[model samples]
Target: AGMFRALFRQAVEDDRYGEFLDVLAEASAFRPQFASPEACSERLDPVLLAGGPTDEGRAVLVGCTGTAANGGPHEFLRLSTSFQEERDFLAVPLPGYGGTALLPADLDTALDAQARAILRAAGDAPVVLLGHSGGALLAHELAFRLERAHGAPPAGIVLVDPYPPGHQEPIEVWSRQLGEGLFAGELEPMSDARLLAMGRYARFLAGPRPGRSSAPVLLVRASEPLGDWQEERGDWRAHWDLPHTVADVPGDHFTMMRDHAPAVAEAVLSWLDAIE
Candidate 1:
């Protein structure tokens, strides 16, 4: 934790990531929930609490991260301040991120766990889950399960340019490529069928939420060239009749997150106000 802070500090002092940091805000907080020594007692084990917005309080936010950016809690801090008035932004680090750890697996399994984690933490409150590129995918897997057991989905879900497998020309190629890199030929590439399971598995659900699922959706998408994202977004919205509003960011894939985090946060706040 301190290491990233130090590195960021050095970057600022050295004037390194000038425009990136300037355009986006980076802030963090750590609250030691309660120390324990029991395995599976993962209720709140050193849960690295972090958020945006210097102001503080208790409104819930259940978040997860993508592959390598697993627990980059700074986003919460930036989002809470710029977007929402004030909410206890809870950035839950997925397994293998910081203090949280989970058995390693292909993309599918990791997200499976992330979905469970998200709903478990989001009790009965107006929760808005903000998920980034990879994290957005995890949020999808979670939404289904949460509705089945909890009776309703999150108050809102913000999928920031989600990635779905079918978007690929030949899903096998990317699966082979990423698998070879992810497991070094250890776990053979997921077959086309399995990869298909990964992309469109959410369709298996029988029906909609118990009531309205009146969950406000904010699909804050990127506006640039993506190999498969363009087609996937179209298919995704069509696949599930999710009522939503698509907001475009200012940059391409990478820079979008940097410059657009604040904008996304702003949208979240607006959506919340409308719902409330």
Candidate 2:
């Protein structure tokens, strides 16, 4: 308790509430050490990258952050290497979240455009959508949009430590509470321009919904709950209106992508295999 007080005081003095809460979450979450997101940036160039020796393998559409940098797939890019034998990886970085792409005023539309691009790249192949963190929300939105645009949904949808859907918190609420550093955008990198884009998007997120999906959903969550993520008692089921497969993987939300990519990929591969 004494140590925690000192740390809290230091964090308060530093004006880093996001970091403070993150540390607080880690203190109790019991997550293992994983590679930092900063340490995982081996790729550069903010464009989409093609995976698999040939495009003949099954299509795996990935939508995640640029792994904190603008470029080729970073978070799940390793999947391309890990599952090269049977899957072709197609990575789509968030639109207007990175590089010089023009920011869209509405978050819903931006996500739709992003989904469209992934569909175009995927062509008519039977694809699986894999999204991590905020990208999971995109993947969820994309599934519905894809079903509307094309007559079918992806074979499966994988969500890793995603933000809760149907949340309607105002941007001002988040700005004042969630801290400017975390909510304003990290991979878009929290600059004035990025913050401006985030404010515009946050309003759209205020009333967004996950809708519904007929496709099988795989939700891989961290083993230990963090800070407010935990419950005082009983099963704290995350709210989802669809039947889904929940896999408890090692590592926390951020670290899981970097250090435990193999475990994540394994769970995804197992589900894909079962669906096949």
Candidate 3:
């Protein structure tokens, strides 16, 4: 806490833009996946590089953040590696969030575009969609695209406390005050035509509905409500299930929510092992 406070104070002194840049640098150094969208050249670039020597389960992780994901995936990979020792997975940035411009600040459309790109990149091997925070919403969306476009779906899906469908707050009241950075930023603050398109797409990605996720699913939910993440009893139950497991870890929005690479690697490898 003290370290973050001191860092935050110094960042404020330098300016938010500078701080944002520093954040990008730190995250990039920890995880190679933080490259600007420009390097997205192909989602499978990393796969080819590592897949050469030994063929392991190929997984694709996609997540949120307006700029780039930094060391986010590094944490997840670190945590998950112990489980699936041979797997070679990669993390792709969400559109407009990391390095891609396909979606822009409006996350819904950006996610939709990102899903298509991921499915395309997966090519022959089955790709698993791993999503966190708002990225969970995208994982679901891309899974749907695989079903529709490919006539099935990816290898599987893991949702890290994804935002349920049609779920929202009356934050619209705050839209005018905050502007695009707030409401309009992610999936579109207004949630109109474009936002709806993105939402439906993500829902499909989550699974086929009536058992959309045939592959195993592991949901790591935040123990303490990051304020409204969890809903009344059975809120998410009806929306999701199957070969599913849940864990409520301690901490609030930042601590519990941010990358916990070690934990992630364990969860993912265990899930894959079960499926095999």
> lDDT, candidate 2, residue 125?
71
Worst lDDT window (10 residues) for model 3? 170-179
lDDT of 2 by residue, 103-153 (tens): 553445555555556666667678787776556765777777668655668
| TM-score-based ranking | 2, 1, 3
Candidate 2 residue runs with Cα over 4 Å from true position: 1-50, 53-57, 64-73, 78-80, 165-189, 228-239
Candidates ranked by lDDT: 2, 1, 3
- Per-residue lDDT of model 3, residues 62-109, tens digit only: 332212122223434433443343564555654422233223323334
Model 1, position 110, has a per-residue lDDT of 38
Better of 2 and 3 by TM-score: 2
Q: How much lDDT does candidate 2 score?
A: 0.54
* Number of the top-ranking candidate, with TM-score as the measure: 2
Pairs clashing in candidate 2? 45-71, 46-71
